[PDB]
Amino acid sequence: DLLKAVRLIKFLYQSNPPPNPEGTRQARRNRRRRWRERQRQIHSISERILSTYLG
Amino acid sequence: SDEDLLKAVRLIKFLYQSNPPPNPEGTRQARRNRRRRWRERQRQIHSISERILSTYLG
Numbered sequence: 001d002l003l004k005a006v007r008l009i010k011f012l013y014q015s016n017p018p019p020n021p022e023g024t025r026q027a028r029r030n031r032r033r034r035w036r037e038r039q040r041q042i043h044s045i046s047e048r049i050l051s052t053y054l055g
Numbered sequence: 056s057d058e059d060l061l062k063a064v065r066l067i068k069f070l071y072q073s074n075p076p077p078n079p080e081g082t083r084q085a086r087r088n089r090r091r092r093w094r095e096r097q098r099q100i101h102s103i104s105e106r107i108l109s110t111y112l113g
Contacts, residue, residue: 008107011099012103015070040062041062041065041066042066045062045063045066045110048059048111049107052110
């Protein structure tokens with residue numbers, strides 16, 4: 001069952017929608033920064049899950 | 056090094072934050088339909104988090 005892995009990864013990517021363009025300069029910038037680090041989390045996790053299937 | 060794990064746990068927290076419990080308003084039938092969708096999303100996040108953490112061997 002690879003399918004569990006792929007649906008999980010799919011779900012992860014679905015869960016980080018673009019950040020809010022609106023608010024103060026710093027609310028705008030802080031949300032971009034948090035979006036980019038969540039995306040790094042999502043990538044690293046996804047890498048790790050697929051690595052269990054080795055390669 | 057624990058970086059990969061703390062990374063996982065912060066994302067998991069975000070996942071749970073994105074599924075807040077509902078306010079019990081509207082028709083009783085809407086209230087129950089809405090708690091039901093919430094439990095299914097919450098269960099989804101729960102199982103996702105577990106597989107993520109089990110990936111770290113613990």
